Amino acid sequence: GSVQIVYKPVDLSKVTSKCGSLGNIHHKPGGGQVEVKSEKLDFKDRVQSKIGSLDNITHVPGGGNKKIETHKLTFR
Amino acid sequence: GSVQIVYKPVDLSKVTSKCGSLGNIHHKPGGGQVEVKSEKLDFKDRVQSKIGSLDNITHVPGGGNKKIETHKLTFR
Amino acid sequence: GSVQIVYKPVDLSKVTSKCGSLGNIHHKPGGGQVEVKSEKLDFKDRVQSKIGSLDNITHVPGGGNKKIETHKLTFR
Amino acid sequence: GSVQIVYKPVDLSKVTSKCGSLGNIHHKPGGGQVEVKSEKLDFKDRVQSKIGSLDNITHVPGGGNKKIETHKLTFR
Amino acid sequence: GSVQIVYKPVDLSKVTSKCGSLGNIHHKPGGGQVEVKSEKLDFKDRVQSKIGSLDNITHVPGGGNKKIETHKLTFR
Amino acid sequence: GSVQIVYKPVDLSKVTSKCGSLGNIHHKPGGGQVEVKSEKLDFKDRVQSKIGSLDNITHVPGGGNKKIETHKLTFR
């Protein structure tokens, strides 16, 4: 049939930050204990897994701004 | 059939940061203990796995800005 | 059939940072213990795996900005 | 003067234990944090001191029996 | 003067243990953090001191029995 | 003057242990962090000091029995 699809999303947006001095940041973890028991692990088809972790992060981006965009057009 | 698809997403967008001095950042973890028991590990078809981690990160990007974009067009 | 697909995504976008002095960053881990027991490892078809890790990262990029873009066009 | 002191304490005592199997003992501390601030420390004449400790003990003596005796005779 | 002192403490005592199997003992500390600030430390005349400790002990003596005896005779 | 002191402490005592198998002992510390700040250390006349320790001990003597005696006879 005479199908017509026009797809023109427009994006002039901005994601912006101003920051002064960024600093004097202390991260001082006091250890710890982690234990995991399992018999069978059986992972299929798009699995993301963490088992038995003791992980420390210090993340100090001067910006850290995010712009996430998705477009999908499906025709049948 | 007479199908017509026009696909012109427009993106003038910006992801921006200004930062002053970035610094005086201390990350000082106090160790720890991790234990994991398993018998069978059986992973198939797009598996991402961490088992038994004791991991430390200091991440200090002057920007660290992200712009993630996805486009899909499906015709049937 | 008389199918017509026009595909012209336009991207003038920018991902930008200004930073002053970047520095005086200290990362000082206090060791640790990790133990993992397993009998069978059986990995197939796009497996990403870490088993038994004691990992330290200091990542200090002056920018560290990311622009990630994906396009797919499927015609049947 | 005609002072006479006789000092003959008699000790036939016993401190005794019987034990079977001694074992299957688990000590698993989960870390912690300790902080102390002080300006002047000024210790004189028989001082015993612990400042800022995070100490773990597992003590499993098969016996661990104690006999402590003091004798004093003083004459002026 | 005609002072007479006789000092014959008698000790036939015993400190005794029997133990079977001694074992299957686990000591697994999860790290930790200790911090101490001081300006002036000024110690004199029989001082015993620990400052800022993160100490682990496993002590498994087959006996560990103690007999401690002190004798003093003083004449002024 | 006609002072007489007789000093004959008698010690037939014993400190004794029997133990079976001694073993299967695990000591597994997960690290840690210790920090100490001081300007002046000023120690005189019989000082015992530990400053900033991260110390691990496994002590497994088959006996580990102690007999301690002090004698003093003083005449002034």
Side-chain angles (χ1 to χ4, degrees):
Chain A
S2 304
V3 184
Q4 177 177 346
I5 311 176
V6 185
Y7 194 95
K8 193 180 175 177
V10 168
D11 187 345
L12 276 69
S13 69
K14 68 181 187 175
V15 188
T16 295
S17 307
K18 300 183 181 184
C19 193
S21 183
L22 175 58
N24 186 24
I25 294 152
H26 300 262
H27 188 190
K28 295 163 65 174
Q33 200 100 353
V34 181
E35 178 172 15
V36 183
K37 174 171 287 177
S38 294
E39 294 275 57
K40 297 187 174 183
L41 303 182
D42 187 356
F43 303 158
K44 311 181 184 183
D45 304 288
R46 310 161 289 181
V47 182
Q48 301 176 27
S49 178
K50 292 182 62 162
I51 299 180
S53 66
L54 183 62
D55 300 352
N56 303 297
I57 300 174
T58 302
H59 182 33
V60 189
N65 296 324
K66 308 189 75 173
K67 181 170 165 61
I68 299 174
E69 181 152 302
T70 288
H71 300 272
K72 184 182 295 188
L73 172 56
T74 298
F75 175 77
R76 287 185 290 210
Chain B
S2 304
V3 185
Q4 175 178 346
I5 309 177
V6 185
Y7 192 93
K8 195 178 178 176
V10 169
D11 186 344
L12 279 70
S13 71
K14 68 182 186 177
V15 188
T16 296
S17 309
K18 300 185 181 186
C19 190
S21 185
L22 172 55
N24 186 23
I25 294 151
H26 300 261
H27 188 191
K28 295 163 64 172
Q33 200 101 354
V34 181
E35 176 169 14
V36 182
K37 172 168 286 176
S38 288
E39 297 279 60
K40 297 188 174 184
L41 307 188
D42 188 356
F43 305 158
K44 310 183 183 185
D45 303 288
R46 308 160 288 181
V47 182
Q48 302 175 27
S49 178
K50 289 182 59 162
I51 301 179
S53 70
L54 182 62
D55 300 352
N56 305 298
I57 300 176
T58 303
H59 184 33
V60 188
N65 297 324
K66 308 193 76 173
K67 180 173 162 64
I68 300 175
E69 196 153 308
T70 288
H71 300 271
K72 184 180 296 190
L73 171 55
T74 297
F75 173 89
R76 287 186 287 206
Chain C
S2 303
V3 186
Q4 176 177 346
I5 308 177
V6 184
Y7 191 91
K8 195 177 178 175
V10 169
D11 182 332
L12 279 71
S13 72
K14 68 183 187 176
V15 188
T16 296
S17 307
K18 300 186 181 186
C19 190
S21 184
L22 173 58
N24 185 23
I25 295 151
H26 300 263
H27 188 191
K28 297 170 65 173
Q33 196 104 358
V34 182
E35 176 169 14
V36 183
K37 173 166 285 177
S38 290
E39 293 276 59
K40 289 191 167 186
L41 308 183
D42 190 357
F43 304 159
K44 310 185 181 187
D45 305 293
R46 310 160 289 181
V47 181
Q48 302 176 27
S49 178
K50 292 187 63 163
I51 301 180
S53 71
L54 182 70
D55 300 350
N56 303 300
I57 298 174
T58 302
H59 184 33
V60 187
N65 297 322
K66 308 195 76 174
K67 175 173 158 62
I68 298 173
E69 189 167 297
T70 285
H71 301 272
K72 184 176 295 190
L73 168 53
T74 295
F75 167 79
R76 291 191 290 207
Chain D
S2 303
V3 189
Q4 177 178 346
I5 308 185
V6 186
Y7 192 93
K8 193 182 175 178
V10 168
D11 197 307
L12 278 71
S13 72
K14 63 183 180 175
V15 189
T16 296
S17 308
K18 301 184 182 185
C19 191
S21 184
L22 176 59
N24 185 23
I25 294 153
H26 300 261
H27 187 191
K28 294 161 65 175
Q33 201 101 355
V34 180
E35 178 172 15
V36 182
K37 174 171 288 177
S38 292
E39 295 275 57
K40 297 185 174 182
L41 303 182
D42 186 356
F43 303 157
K44 310 181 184 183
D45 305 290
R46 310 161 289 180
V47 180
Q48 302 176 27
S49 178
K50 292 183 62 163
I51 300 179
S53 66
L54 183 62
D55 300 351
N56 303 298
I57 300 174
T58 301
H59 181 36
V60 188
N65 298 318
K66 306 189 72 172
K67 183 173 164 75
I68 302 175
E69 295 193 11
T70 289
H71 299 269
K72 186 185 299 188
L73 173 58
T74 294
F75 194 108
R76 287 179 292 171
Chain E
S2 304
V3 186
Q4 176 178 345
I5 308 185
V6 183
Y7 191 95
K8 194 178 177 176
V10 168
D11 194 303
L12 277 70
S13 75
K14 61 186 178 176
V15 189
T16 297
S17 309
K18 301 186 182 186
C19 190
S21 184
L22 173 55
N24 186 23
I25 294 151
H26 300 262
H27 188 191
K28 294 163 66 173
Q33 200 100 353
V34 181
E35 176 169 13
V36 183
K37 174 170 287 177
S38 289
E39 296 278 61
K40 296 187 174 183
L41 308 188
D42 187 356
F43 305 160
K44 310 183 182 186
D45 303 292
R46 310 161 288 181
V47 182
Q48 303 176 28
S49 178
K50 292 188 65 163
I51 300 179
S53 70
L54 182 62
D55 300 348
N56 304 297
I57 301 176
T58 303
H59 183 35
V60 188
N65 298 320
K66 306 193 73 173
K67 182 174 163 77
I68 302 175
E69 294 191 8
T70 288
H71 299 270
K72 187 183 299 190
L73 169 54
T74 293
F75 194 112
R76 281 180 286 173
Chain F
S2 303
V3 187
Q4 177 179 345
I5 306 185
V6 185
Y7 190 92
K8 197 183 179 180
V10 165
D11 187 298
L12 279 71
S13 76
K14 66 180 183 175
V15 188
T16 296
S17 306
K18 300 185 183 190
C19 188
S21 185
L22 173 58
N24 186 22
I25 296 149
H26 301 262
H27 188 192
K28 295 162 65 172
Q33 196 101 356
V34 182
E35 176 167 21
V36 182
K37 182 166 291 185
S38 290
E39 294 281 67
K40 289 193 168 187
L41 310 181
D42 190 356
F43 306 154
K44 303 189 178 189
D45 306 303
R46 314 152 290 183
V47 178
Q48 305 183 27
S49 177
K50 297 193 66 153
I51 302 181
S53 69
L54 180 77
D55 298 349
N56 303 303
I57 296 169
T58 302
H59 184 34
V60 186
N65 298 320
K66 309 194 77 176
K67 178 172 159 69
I68 295 173
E69 281 182 26
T70 290
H71 298 272
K72 180 176 295 188
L73 170 56
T74 295
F75 192 110
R76 288 179 289 177

